[PDB]
Amino acid sequence: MREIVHIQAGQCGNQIGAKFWEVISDEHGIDPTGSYHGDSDLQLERINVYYNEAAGNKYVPRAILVDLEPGTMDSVRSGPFGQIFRPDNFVFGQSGAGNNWAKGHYTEGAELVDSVLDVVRKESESCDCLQGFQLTHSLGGGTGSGMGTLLISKIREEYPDRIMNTFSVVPSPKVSDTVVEPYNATLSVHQLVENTDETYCIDNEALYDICFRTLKLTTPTYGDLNHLVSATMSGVTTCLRFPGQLNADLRKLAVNMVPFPRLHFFMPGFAPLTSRGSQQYRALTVPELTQQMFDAKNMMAACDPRHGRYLTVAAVFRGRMSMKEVDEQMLNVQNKNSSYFVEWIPNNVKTAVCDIPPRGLKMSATFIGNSTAIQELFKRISEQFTAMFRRKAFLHWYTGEGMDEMEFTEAESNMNDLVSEYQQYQDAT
Amino acid sequence: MREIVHIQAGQCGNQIGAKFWEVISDEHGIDPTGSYHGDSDLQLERINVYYNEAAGNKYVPRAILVDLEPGTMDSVRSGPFGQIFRPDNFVFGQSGAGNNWAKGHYTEGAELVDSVLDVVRKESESCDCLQGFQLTHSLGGGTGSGMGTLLISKIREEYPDRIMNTFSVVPSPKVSDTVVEPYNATLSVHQLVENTDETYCIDNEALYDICFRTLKLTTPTYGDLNHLVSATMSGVTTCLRFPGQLNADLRKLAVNMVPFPRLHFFMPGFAPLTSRGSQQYRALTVPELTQQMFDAKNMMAACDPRHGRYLTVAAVFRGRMSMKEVDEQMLNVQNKNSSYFVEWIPNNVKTAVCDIPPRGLKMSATFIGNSTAIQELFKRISEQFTAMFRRKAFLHWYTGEGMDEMEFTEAESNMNDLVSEYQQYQDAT
Amino acid sequence: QALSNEKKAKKVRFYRNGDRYFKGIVYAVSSDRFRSFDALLADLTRSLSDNINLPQGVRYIYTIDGSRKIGSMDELEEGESYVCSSDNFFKKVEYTKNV
Ligand SMILES: Nc1nc2c(ncn2[C@@H]2O[C@H](COP(=O)(O)OP(=O)(O)O)[C@@H](O)[C@H]2O)c(=O)[nH]1
Ligand SMILES: Nc1nc2c(ncn2[C@@H]2O[C@H](COP(=O)(O)OP(=O)(O)O)[C@@H](O)[C@H]2O)c(=O)[nH]1
C-alpha cells in the first residue's frame, strides 16, 4: 500500500517530471513501452506506489499533468518515455497563462480546476491506502504559481489528513527570468504556508554552480540540471520503496523536520557528485559522503547555511554500510560545529538507511536540512515586492482580473510575519 | 422455447435493425448466406429465440420490417446481411408518411396494418412458447411515430399478457431534426404509456458525445452510432440466450425495474468503451466496469442522473467473474451516493450474470437504470408542444386527416400527469 | 499622474436559467475587456452551455430577483448575481440558495 499521486504543473514542473519518471523507471526497470525487463524481484514488490498495473503486464505512472496551453504537453508525449503516460491524464486548456498569477489562479484556472479534480478523485479511489500527494511547480511563471496553488487549496479542503509536499522552484536572486517574479512569488508563498506540510525550495542559480564547479561540465543543458532535482526526489521516498535497516518515509520526515506548523521550508542536497575524470581520485566511504553534504557549495537553495543556524537535519543514506560509521559521523559534525546548530533541540539529526543503491553507484545520500538560513531568501522576495509595489507598477494586469490592493497587503504582511519567526528562533535561549 | 418476434418501423428503426441483425449473427456465427460456420455448440442450443430453422440447415431472422415507401427497404436488401431476411416479411406501402403522425396513424396506416398483422399472426403461431415482442422505431418521424403506435394497440388488444418493449428514439433537445417533432413526440407518448411495458429512451445527442469524447472517433457515421444501440439491445436478452450463474430475462426486468404501471421509461448504458489506442492503458476488472456505468458521460438518454434520484438499477454483466466482486461493487456505489437513490426502496439494484462475453472482449456490462432524471426529458417536449400549440400553427396538416383540437388537449394533459408523478416520487418520505 | 483610474473588474456571478445544480462563475467584468455590452454576450456563449441547456444561446440577461431586463454594462453592480436566460419566459427557482 501507501500509494502516492504525482501532480505536475506549469512548463517547468512538466519538464522536471518528464526527467523524473525516466529516473524512477531506471530503478524499477521499465522500458519506454511500459513492460518489465528487470533482474531482481525487489523491483516489483513495492511497485504500486508510483504505478497502476494495467492488463497485460504493463505499468502506467500515477501522474497528473496540468498546463494552460498545449505547447508543453506536445513535447512530453513526443519525447522518450512519453508513450508511458496515459492519454487521459493530459489535462490542459487553451487560453494560456500569459505569465500571470491572476490569470493562473482566478480566471483561467477556474475553467480547468474542475477537470483536474475529476482526474484527482479517480486516482484517489483506485489506491488502497493513500500515502499522500506530491507536486512539482515553480513560483516564477504563471501556471505553476496560479494553477498549482489553486489545486493545493482544493485538495486540502477535501483531504485534511494526507501529506502534501511541493518541490517548488524559488526564483534566483541575481538574474531574473521574469520581470514580475516578485509578484508571482509573494502571492504564492501566502498560499503555501497555509495549505502544505513541507516544501523543498530549489533555486536555479545553485544548480548552475554544481554543474560548473563540482561536476566540471562544459555545456549544461536542462537535462543535466533536472537530473539533479530528480535524483533528489527519488532519494526522499527511497526507503518507502525498498527494504532498509532503519526506515523513514514522508510521514516521519514531516514529524521530525517540522517543529512548528509554519516553519517548513527546506533546502535539499545530494551526494556524491564527482566529475567525469575525477571519479577515480576519491574513496567512497561514509565520512567522505558526510563531508560533502554539509558544505555551502553543494546546497540547492541559494543561501549559505553559515549565516543562520540549523534546526533539523535529515540524512537518508543508500547502499549497504555500517550503522556505527553513520552514527559516528552524525555526532562528529554536531560537536565541532556546535555554534551552527540550535541549542534547545538536542540530537537534531534524523537518520534513515536504505539498502539498494542508485543505478550505477555503490552508496549515495540525500540531505534534507531545515535552517534559519532561508530568511535571506524571503528578504529578497519581500524587498523586491515592496520596491515594485510602492510605485503600483505592473499592477493593472492584476486589477483587471478581479483583485484589489488589499490582497497585496495581507500577502506581504504574511511574509514579514515569517521572517520575524526565523529571526526569533535564531536567537533563542 | 421463449421466442421473440422482432418488429421494425420507420426509416430509423430499419437502419437500427439492419445493424442489429449483423450483431446477433456475429454471436451465433451466421454467414450472410444464412448457413452456420461456428465453433461452439452453445451457439446452436438457444438459436430458436431469434431464428426459424429452414430446410437445409439455414436460419432466417424472425423479423417484420414495416415502412410506408420502398426507399428504405431497397437499402436493406441491397446491403450485407440483406439476403438473410425472408422476402415475404417486407411489408410496405406506396403513399409515404410525409413526416406526419396523422398520416402515419390514421389514414395510410389503416391500409397497411391489416397486412402487417397477418405476418404477425403467422409468426406468432409458428413459435412454441411466445416470450414477447420487441419494437424499434423513433418518436420524431412519421412512420415510426404513427405506424408503430398503431401496431402496438392492435397487438395489445390481441395479446394482453405478453411483454412489449420498444427501443424508441426520443428527439434531442438542442438540435431539432424535425420541425414538427414536438407534435410527433407528444402524440406518441400518449400511446406508449398505455400499451407497453418498458421503453428504452435513446437520444441522438448523447450518442454523438460518446463517439467524440469517449471512443475518440473522428468521423462517426451512423454505422458507428447504431452499433452502440445494437450492442445494448443484445445485452438485454443475453442471459436468455446463454447459460449464466444468475439469470434474468425480459420478464424479470419488467417486474424489478417497474414499480408502478406508468413509470417505465428507462435509460440505457454500455461499458466498457475504450479508444483505439487507449485500450491498453486500462485494466478490465469489475470495479473498473462499475465506475464507468454510473457517470453522466456514458448514458444514452440526454439527462444527467444527478438532477434526480434513481429508483431501480439493472446491471447485466457478461463474461466469467467473481460474484463477490460484483456484489461488493453494487453495495459500494449505493452507500456513498446515498442521496442519489430513493429511500423507500431498499436494495434497489438487480444483478444478472451471464457467462459468454461479446465477440472480441473479455467481460462487458449493460446498464438499465430507471430514474426521476427523465422528468427533464418530458419538460422539454411538453414545453415545446405548448409553445407551438397556443398559436395553433402547423395544425392544418393534422386537422385535414381527421383530428380535432381535443385530441391535443388530452395528449398534453396525459404528459403533465406523468411529470407530476416523477416529481412526487422524487420527494417521498 | 501615473497612479491611473485603477481599471477594475467587477466580481459578478452568473446563474444560468433553470439549472438548479449550478453555481455561477465569477467573471472579471470590466470596461477594458468589453468595449460594448454586445461583446459580453459572446463570452457568455461558450462558458455557460456545455451539453444540456440553452439551444437558443444567450439573449436576455435578467436580475436575480428577477423583474428587470439588463440593458448596457452601466446597469450592473459589484457583487450581485444575475440570471442568464435566452427567452422572454423566466423560471422562478431558488438560485442563490447554498452558494
Ligand atoms: N530548473 C528548471 N527550471 C525551469 C526549467 N524550465 C523552466 N524553468 C523555470 O520556469 C520558470 C518560467 O516559468 P514556466 O516554466 O514557463 O512556468 P509557467 O509560466 O507557470 O507555466 C523560470 O523560473 C525557469 O527557471 C527547467 O527545465 N528546469
Ligand atoms: N440513431 C439514429 N437515428 C436515426 C437514424 N436514421 C434516422 N434517425 C432518426 O430518425 C428520425 C427521422 O425520421 P425517420 O427515420 O425518417 O422515420 P419516419 O419518418 O417515421 O419514417 C430522426 O430523429 C433521426 O435522428 C440512424 O441511423 N440512427
Q: Cβ neighbours of residue B176 under 8 Å, at least 6 residues apart?
A: none
Other Cβ atoms closer than 10 A to A231: 18
Ligand 2 pocket, B10 CB below 6 A? yes
Contact predicate B98/B72, CB 8 Å = no
Ligand number nearest CA of B203 is 2
Partners of C26 in the β-ladder: none
- Nearest CB to C55 within list B174, B303, B304: B174
Distance CA A168, CA A145 (A): 9
Q: What letter represents residue C30's amino acid?
A: S
- Nearest CB to C9 within list A110, A111, A399: A399
To the nearest whole Å, the CA of C29 is away from the closest chain A CA by 8
Of A250, A336, A259, A254, the C-alpha closest to A290 is A336
- Pull the grid cell for residue A228: 539533479
β pairing state of B3-9 and A349-354: unpaired
Distance CA B165, CA B236 (A): 11
Q: Do A400 and C3 touch (CB under 8 A)?
A: no
Known binding-site positions of A for Mg(2+): 69
Q: Do C26 and A110 touch (CB under 8 A)?
A: yes
Q: What letter represents residue A425's amino acid?
A: Y
Q: Starting from the edge strand earliest in sequence, which strands make up the sheet with B268-271, in order?
A: B244-246, B349-354, B310-317, B365-371, B268-271
To the nearest whole Å, the CA of A404 is away from the closest chain C CA by 8
Helical (H) or strand (E) element with B39 = none
Partners of A270 in the β-ladder: A366
Write out chain B residues lying below 8 Å of C50, CB-based: none
B139 touches C: beta carbon within 8 Å? no
Interface with C, mutate which of B170, B172, B174, B340 (most C CBs under 10 A)? B174
Neighbours of chain B (3+ CB pairs under 8 A): A, C
Q: Cβ neighbours of residue C79 under 8 Å, at least 6 residues apart?
A: C10, C11, C12
Q: Cβ neighbours of residue B410 under 8 Å, at least 6 residues apart?
A: B190
Distance CA A198, CA B387 (A): 61
- Reported resolution in A? 3.8
Interface with C, mutate which of A113, A396, A398 (most C CBs under 10 A)? A396
- Pull the grid cell for residue A171: 526564483
Residue B194 annotated in ligand binding:
no
Side-chain half-sphere exposure of A173, counting CA atoms within 13 A: 13
Q: Closest chain A residue to C78 measured between Cα atoms?
A: A402
* Chain C residues within 8 Å of chain A (Cβ atoms): 2-4, 6-11, 25-28, 30, 32-33, 47
- Nearest CB to B173 within list C20, C21, C55: C55
- Nearest CB to B209 within list C20, C51, C55: C51
B173 touches C: beta carbon within 8 Å? yes
Distance CA B125, CA B118 (A): 11
Helical (H) or strand (E) element with B134 = strand B130-136
CA distances from A137 to A9, A15, A67, B91, B331 (A): 5, 10, 11, 68, 40
Contact predicate B315/B220, CB 8 Å = no
Helical (H) or strand (E) element with B184 = helix B181-195
To the nearest whole Å, the CA of B376 is away from the closest chain C CA by 10
Distance CA B197, CA B210 (A): 28
B284 touches A: beta carbon within 8 Å? yes
Residue with cell 452499433: B227
Q: Do C7 and A392 touch (CB under 8 A)?
A: no
- Pull the grid cell for residue B264: 417505465
Q: Closest chain A residue to C4 measured between Cα atoms?
A: A396
To the nearest whole Å, the CA of A113 is away from the closest chain C CA by 12
Distance CA A236, CA B371 (A): 50
Buried b / exposed e across A315-338, counting CB within 10 Å, b at 16+? Answer: bbbbbebeeeebeebbeebbeeee
Longest C-alpha distance within chain B, in Å? Answer: 63
Distance CA A295, CA A99 (A): 35
Grouping H, G, I as helix, E, B as strand and the rest as coil, residue A59 is strand
Ligand 2 pocket, B97 CB below 6 A? yes
Distance CA A31, CA A60 (A): 11
Ligand number nearest CA of A73 is 1
Determination technique for this entry: cryo-EM
To the nearest whole Å, the CA of A86 is away from the closest chain B CA by 6
A55 touches B: beta carbon within 8 Å? yes
Distance A183 CA to ligand 1 centre (A): 16
- Considering only CA atoms, which residue is closest to atom 9 of ligand 2? B12
Ligand 1 pocket, A99 CB below 6 A? yes
Ligand 1 pocket, A9 CB below 6 A? no
Radius of gyration of chain C (CA): 14
Residue with cell 403533465: B416
Of A76, A182, A68, A57, the C-alpha closest to A116 is A68
To the nearest whole Å, the CA of C12 is away from the closest chain A CA by 10
Grouping H, G, I as helix, E, B as strand and the rest as coil, residue B360 is coil
Write out chain A residues lying below 8 Å of B283, CB-based: 52-55
Q: How far from each other are the two terminal CA atoms of chain A, in whole angstroms?
A: 44
Q: Cβ neighbours of residue B303 under 8 Å, at least 6 residues apart?
A: B267, B371, B373, B374, B376, B377, C52
- Considering only CA atoms, which residue is closest to atom 19 of ligand 1? A141
Residue B328 annotated in ligand binding:
no
Contact predicate B61/B136, CB 8 Å = no
Q: Cβ neighbours of residue B330 under 8 Å, at least 6 residues apart?
A: B290, B315, B349, B351
Write out chain A residues lying below 8 Å of C10, CB-based: 402
Of A371, A406, A422, A411, the C-alpha closest to A185 is A411
Sign of the dihedral defined by the CA atoms of residues B410, B414, B419, B421, in that order: positive
Q: What letter represents residue A165's amino acid?
A: N
Q: Closest chain C residue to A395 measured between Cα atoms?
A: C6
The fold of the C1-99 domain, in CATH, is Ubiquitin-like (UB roll) (3.10.20)
Ligand 2 pocket, B177 CB below 6 A? yes
CA distances from A311 to A261, A264, A317, B289 (A): 14, 11, 20, 51
* Domains of chain B with bracketed CATH: 1-259 (3.40.50.1440), 260-373 (3.30.1330.20), 374-429 (1.10.287.600)
- Nearest CB to A53 within list B277, B283, B291: B283
- Pull the grid cell for residue B127: 413459435
- Nearest CB to B173 within list C20, C21, C52: C52
Of B184, B157, B156, B159, the C-alpha closest to B170 is B184
Domain boundaries, chain C: 1-99
- Considering only CA atoms, which residue is closest to atom 2 of ligand 2? B12
Which atom of ligand 2 is nearest to B171's Cα? 23
A420 touches C: beta carbon within 8 Å? no
Q: Starting from the edge strand earliest in sequence, which strands make up the sheet with B3-9, in order?
A: B90-92, B63-67, B3-9, B130-136, B163-166, B198-200, B265-266
Q: How far is CA A149 from the centre of its chain?
A: 14
Distance A169 CA to ligand 1 centre (A): 8
Other Cβ atoms closer than 10 A to A99: 20
Distance CA B295, CA B340 (A): 12
